[PDB]
Design a protein around this ligand. Structure first.
Ligand SMILES: CS(=O)(=O)c1ccc(C(O)=C2C(=O)CCCC2=O)c([N+](=O)[O-])c1
Ligand SMILES: CS(=O)(=O)c1ccc(C(O)=C2C(=O)CCCC2=O)c([N+](=O)[O-])c1
Ligand SMILES: [Co+2]
Ligand SMILES: [Co+2]
Lengths: 366, 369
């Protein structure tokens, strides 16, 4: 009776691959990284600070699976830098106006020199030219939205100037990669026009107080949703963050029950807090909608963990959200596990849009 | 046939009680407060942030016994505040230029209204005049060294504005009970002691590498404030001074009712968010312990020091267990000291000293072969 048809022109203007890393910018990178390390279960595995010769910034790298979080903070200008786009004047201005937040959204491409030239010839505002690192890595950044940039990394074979680390049954709760990354802007329209203009990402098709549109690369493994405000928590983000900027990171986990039992045990001891949980009638209503996909016990396991379930035409998406990460109510994190389109299709299950109404309906029915 | 003689003129110019709290100025206090809380074993007790109506700064207060560690970072000017000494321009420049560190070292007093008037009269530079909060508490701040301020907290009989924190069954506790002392790094010791002692009346508490130290003390000798200058000809005092961009607080000793229970808990967490300690002394260091502190510790308590990297020193009055963490933030500046003092029971302040005999004991032990 029902059918949902999707288009994919594959209009990528240059060839991209995968999410590479995210770069948090902060004031003291050691504590943000040691916090996030115990909350998310990410192994400290590369660094570039004083003990490595870097007298410009302290950059630490947390890895879990392929997911790579880089934490960067400036030292005193009175004092070698491995990241060629770093600057005290821009980093101090970033953190003053926005607080703890994502500075770069980084994606592996075939060639960063071309990826940047084609971008800038297609409307992209440049933020950092192509710089070859030790004849091994190329790095370039164009403005994405607000003071967030889209960062192109390319190889010929973490980064030059980084040392390795391995010592900590090390930290691993099941997080395996970055699924999608989300910004908020004032006016979605011009933002979609800009971004899709210089990348050729096609709009992804989905099944209160925001309007959402999702860009995807040719393989739809580089997903970028964007939200505009229609009270509206999108509007609250823009005020506290002082402009456009990134809203959440969704982390793909190989077992969302493993990940969640770990991250809820640590909420009150340095880890991360979560949204208050749906009413029990939300989970009583699961069997009627996804009981062909989740066994009763896994349904039990979602109620026991506050885990949201939605599905669209292809598969089913399990998701739960944290509270804000630092001071301001701005950046939160989303933990997701996608089930269904096994080949795994990018975006299997969508992004959770269905849960707004399905959560309202569960509230009303006791 | 030796005796160490201590004088105590008890020259306090006002009446001071104990250490009250330490305030770290941050950029994002949530991750620092949470890092410290898991790392030291201190409970979340109060807040003053957006959730409670404060829209100028976020402050999260961690306690553990009597130790009170307050964490404050500024919001955006575009947005209620419970600490009348705060400033966005002051907190930005404090964090741009010194990194994460101590802003204020706060002491309880009979009257902060009078502690300030006397201090300013004897040289001390005023930083925040006395301000009564909800007609219940009074707060004032005079410049200590660099951008540290000495802060006076007097009661009529955590603070006004703070919402008390929620429960998690048996919250964190590794044994830390109070702030023993709060050490400073100055370029010149002389002008340091003259200025501080000139306005506090605190007296030189006598002691039994590349630095010179003098310990300043109130009439009960329970508020302790050692001060350090560098000796040139390398010096960690001088290395502090460059990364900190001037004078500032160098370390906090955290008294613990069982240093082993604290170092067992803390060392378990070093690589899962916690704190890291300096490399442990050679094993000859501890073979030497029997003959200098065997009359105070057992054979099993000298083993527990080795299995833990703990250092032992003693005075004419008592013995001093101590261990040191690596620098708590990005910059190589402020660190934390975990100590527990044995003896001087009536417990006195400055039982066992401050560890100054451990420079040569460590160096002596290092000559293994
Ligand atoms: C109302 S809810 O089910 O809790 C809920 C459900 C889904 C999301 C989701 O992350 C967002 C997507 O990434 C991109 C499109 C908009 C959107 O909604 C959120 N959200 O993070 O705002 C909340
Ligand atoms: C030789 S040692 O064991 O490393 C060692 C032993 C004692 C201390 C001690 O806490 C300090 C005192 O409180 C004040 C005097 C200066 C000083 O040295 C430290 N320290 O400055 O970290 C190191
Ligand atoms: Co999402
Ligand atoms: Co000390």
């Amino acid at each position: 009776f029902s059918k949902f048809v999707r288009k994919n022109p594959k209009s990528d203007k240059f060839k991209v691959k995968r999410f590479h890393h995210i770069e948090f910018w902060c004031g003291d990178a050691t504590n943000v990284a040691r916090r996030f390390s115990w909350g998310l279960g990410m192994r400290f595995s590369a660094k570039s600070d004083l003990s490595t010769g870097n007298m410009v910034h302290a950059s630490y790298l947390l890895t879990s699976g392929d997911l790579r979080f880089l934490f960067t903070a400036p030292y005193s200008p009175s004092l070698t830098a491995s990241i060629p786009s770093f600057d005290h004047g821009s980093c101090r201005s970033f953190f003053s106006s926005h607080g703890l937040g994502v500075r770069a959204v980084a994606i592996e491409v075939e060639d960063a020199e071309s990826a940047f030239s084609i971008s800038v010839a297609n409307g992209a505002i440049p933020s950092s030219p192509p710089i070859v690192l030790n004849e091994a890595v190329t790095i370039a950044e164009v403005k994405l939205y607000g003071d967030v940039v889209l960062r192109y990394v390319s190889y010929k074979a973490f980064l030059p100037g980084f040392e390795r680390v391995e010592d900590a049954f090390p930290l691993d709760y099941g997080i395996r990669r970055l699924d999608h990354a989300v910004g908020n802007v004032p006016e979605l329209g011009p933002a979609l026009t800009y971004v899709a203009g210089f990348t050729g990402f096609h709009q992804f098709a989905e099944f209160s107080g925001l309007n959402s549109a999702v860009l995807a690369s040719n393989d739809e493994m580089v997903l970028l949703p964007i939200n505009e405000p229609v009270k509206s928590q999108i509007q609250t983000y823009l005020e506290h963050n002082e402009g456009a900027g990134l809203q959440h990171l969704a982390l793909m986990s190989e077992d969302i029950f493993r990940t969640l039992r770990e991250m809820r045990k640590r909420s009150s001891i340095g880890g991360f807090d979560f949204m208050p949980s749906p009413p029990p009638t939300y989970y009583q209503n699961l069997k009627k909608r996804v009981g062909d996909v989740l066994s009763d016990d896994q349904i039990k396991e979602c109620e026991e963990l506050g885990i949201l379930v939605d599905r669209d035409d292809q598969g089913t998406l399990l998701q739960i959200f944290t509270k804000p990460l630092g001071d301001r109510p701005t950046i939160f994190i989303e933990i997701i596990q996608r089930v269904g389109c096994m080949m795994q299709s990018g975006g299997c299950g969508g992004f959770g849009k269905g849960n707004f109404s399905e959560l309202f309906k569960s509230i009303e029915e006791y």
